[PDB]
């Protein structure tokens with residue numbers, strides 16, 4: 001038993017991290033086959049960060065201006081092109097450690113692991129969730145750009161995130177691996193504000209089920225509710241409206257415990273209205289919303305990679 | 306910016322996980338150079354778990370009774386022995402992925418990452434801390450035995466923990482890599498109690514420092530305290546006595562923030578007596594005690610491996 005915020009093992013991804021330098025800017029890149037992916041703002045100086053014309057800067061660069069470093073070895077850049085906000089450096093060597101991989105765009109409420117890197121080497125691994133305002137709550141310092149987020153299914157790594165920027169509230173924003181930002185963000189040094197976020201209700205419900213699976217059951221009551229009466233309360237607390245698709249997604253966890261989803265909604269409704277009265281659930285004093293229903297099933301059943 | 310519960314990158318350890326089977330029992334092993342380490346109770350049946358005579362059980366086995374599998378390739382066992390509660394299986398092949406490594410024994414209050422495995426393949430990675438009752442609060446299912454806990458310093462892997470068993474409150478117990486249990490636990494299926502645990506005061510203070518570094522300041526107040534008056538308060542709330550060694554250890558974090566340690570102690574003291582008033586600190590509604598002072602500095606400075 002037990003239930004922890006659990007990251008995917010990062011080995012398959014560590015073997016893909018390199019260091020990309022362009023003039024005096026250094027950040028991380030992702031080396032897959034014979035292409036290195038990194039944020040296009042590697043070609044900027046600190047000066048032209050206010051309003052950079054990336055296409056214009058790129059036409060002034062040559063292949064030898066991009067220094068790519070895998071560990072201690074220099075890779076040789078033989079081509080480059082720009083795709084939205086990512087740079088793609090063709091190098092003359094295919095990464096022998098390249099895993100099976102896809103580039104995917106996740107939806108708000110989905111989770112992934114982050115391998116935080118500096119100078120092409122790994123610092124730490126952690127979980128976070130794509131929020132409804134298209135930010136994430138990560139831990140990123142200077143030089144962390146180009147670190148990636150990913151999921152692993154069997155042996156295939158699904159790359160979903162590449163880090164680009166921090167926002168005023170201490171949250172973070174990035175692109176998919178096609179260079180498209182999540183949310184209304186751009187890679188410029190202008191004032192950008194995240195936007196208002198909601199609690200991922202379907203994840204809170206999943207986590208309560210995880211709690212039941214682990215014997216934490218003080219919060220269960222004998223009541224039921226409807227989607228309407230629940231969403232009335234949920235809206236007051238800035239929780240995302242629960243849909244029947246959400247109820248269906250919670251099906252597997254509902255059957256494993258024998259607690260109908262609307263019965264669990266009645267427990268969440270009471271938790272939201274009465275607080276937690278100084279108590280905890282799975283060692284937490286607040287309601288956790290960064291475990292997907294898949295996360296719970298994965299951790300509570302023992303799936304490996 | 307941001308502060309997360311962060312695990313060490315797990316690549317170096319992933320290359321060491323193998324699958325060890327003996328009869329109908331399968332668990333995980335750690336393959337370093339030409340030796341595989343795993344819990345000795347891989348040799349028990351479900352029957353003889355009440356009071357296993359391991360020496361008697363071991364002498365009945367030969368090398369070819371130990372099925373060891375690194376990924377999909379079968380290893381050849383050419384010797385075996387027992388050292389306390391770990392089994393050492395000598396194989397004819399040195400693990401080509403062996404990292405630089407040490408075996409260390411961690412002390413209560415230190416942290417490490419756990420690479421949880423099933424059937425010899427890595428499933429997820431998470432941080433936890435050795436509790437003063439010699440338990441950890443992990444996430445372990447049937448078949449996770451043989452999973453190891455570890456820290457990384459630059460390039461060296463320090464193996465500190467191998468998983469063995471679950472205890473009454475849903476917590477976990479294991480050995481170091483010489484097979485010596487942490488705490489008053491034995492590898493038998495008998496009534497064993499963890500013992501009473503305390504909150505790791507020096508870690509709470511370190512995390513309060515991380516909060517200030519990351520812009521969370523509302524808990525700083527106009528007070529100071531002394532070690533003696535603080536320890537009067539901590540004892541009531543089942544916190545570990547704070548020592549002068551603890552004060553000195555928090556020194557670097559104290560200098561980085563310009564908040565004297567005894568001033569931060571006065572902030573913890575008021576938090577303990579009056580709670581948090583519906584506010585949070587680093588997105589947590591309770592006081593976190595599983596970041597050591599070293600974890601905080603390391604995460605906030607960007608140290609890589």
Ligand SMILES: *[C@](O)(C(=O)NCc1ccccc1)[C@H](C[C@@H]1CCNC1=O)NC(=O)[C@H](CC1CC1)n1cccc(NC(=O)OC(C)(C)C)c1=O
Pocket residue numbers: 025026027041049140141142143144145146164165166167168169170172186187188189190306
């Ligand atoms: C990113 O470029 C990086 O990791 N490394 C490049 C680098 C910078 C400095 C020294 C060596 C190498 C950084 C990562 C940021 C910095 C701290 N935490 C992060 O996530 N990304 C940016 O600097 C980013 C570049 C923009 C997208 C093109 N950037 C520039 C200017 C402002 C901000 N945001 C900001 O000012 O934050 C607030 C909270 C509003 C003060 C920004 O993210």
Ligand SMILES: *[C@](O)(C(=O)NCc1ccccc1)[C@H](C[C@@H]1CCNC1=O)NC(=O)[C@H](CC1CC1)n1cccc(NC(=O)OC(C)(C)C)c1=O
Pocket residue numbers: 001330331332346354445446447448449450451469470471472473474475477491492493494
């Ligand atoms: C460990 O052996 C393992 O991971 N795999 C062997 C295996 C078991 C079942 C099916 C296939 C393979 C487990 C790990 C445990 C199991 C679930 N969560 C864990 O952390 N260790 C044991 O099962 C352990 C073996 C004992 C040390 C020699 N064991 C056996 C019987 C009972 C318990 N604990 C227990 O009863 O918990 C309480 C809370 C007291 C009810 C036990 O840990």
Ligand SMILES: [Cl-]
Pocket residue numbers: 379380381382
């Ligand atoms: Cl063989």
